Subunit: 88 residues, 3 copies
């Protein structure tokens, strides 16, 4: 089936749910006023996520896997880019 | 194999582990004095979870997926019910 | 594909990413100065993780599943050992 990963922050809260569906990962977002589709859209069959809130900044790391390749995607306030993570 | 998701809160801590096994999701709970089976029991092939502790209240969101359908289940102090989450 | 689980703590942050790949779970670690391979290496087809930071101590629980058997692995400052978790 589709596979999901979820994270949340604050007291509202903000929630992000990532779904790997048919080789594509998309993102659904809740910030207290309805669910909406987020900017994250990248290939993957499996997804995990962690996040940490520091001051006014949310930092999100999404680990997207296809086959034996895992790509880390980073949100640090200014869009998603690939991070330095490697599997070995 | 079976697939799990885990969350924890406080300093004891309380831990919740959700297992998707043969199309059913069940819940195991630790609050510092032994593991026990929790109230959550719903269909699903895949599970993720996030939680946030505010004051004296734990809020838990469990994302249960079967095929391409994901159902959000909500704990806000008074049993589990379906939440407003949709995949699109 | 390979399946991952991730957790993080503090403001650096420290990040741990567990990958179930071909029946084996390994661990990649970030503490602010490069990714490296951690001590955790145990069998499993699926992995989840949760952690909680108390004072100067990180506590990590990794749930490793093979077939219908899930083993909890515990980090409490002194290496990884099996925990009391059972699926029922
Ligand atoms: O629109 C909300 C948003 O900016 O929040 C932070 C990240 O989750 C982004 O992908 C997302 O688009
Ligand atoms: O700022 C991005 C970055 O340094 O954040 C910490 C880790 O997620 C790294 O892999 C990543 O490149
Ligand atoms: O009994 C403990 C319990 O109430 O804790 C909160 C939720 O995890 C419930 O499913 C669970 O039954
Ligand atoms: O109180 C329940 C609720 O509003 O909590 C926030 C989100 O999880 C929503 O999907 C959900 O319906
Ligand atoms: O070397 C860093 C380390 O000790 O951090 C705590 C755990 O993640 C361990 O598996 C890991 O080896
Ligand atoms: O100190 C280890 C332990 O007691 O921690 C809490 C739970 O993870 C238990 O299953 C585990 O045996």
């Amino acid at each position: 089936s589709v596979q999901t990963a979820a994270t949340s922050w604050g007291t509202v809260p903000s929630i992000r749910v990532y779904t790997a569906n048919n080789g594509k990962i998309t993102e659904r977002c809740w910030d207290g006023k309805g669910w909406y589709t987020g900017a994250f859209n990248e290939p993957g069959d499996n997804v995990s996520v962690t996040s940490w809130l520091v001051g006014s900044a949310i930092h999100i790391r999404v680990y997207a896997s296809t086959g034996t390749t895992t790509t880390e995607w980073c949100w640090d306030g200014n869009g998603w880019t690939k991070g330095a993570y490697t599997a070995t």
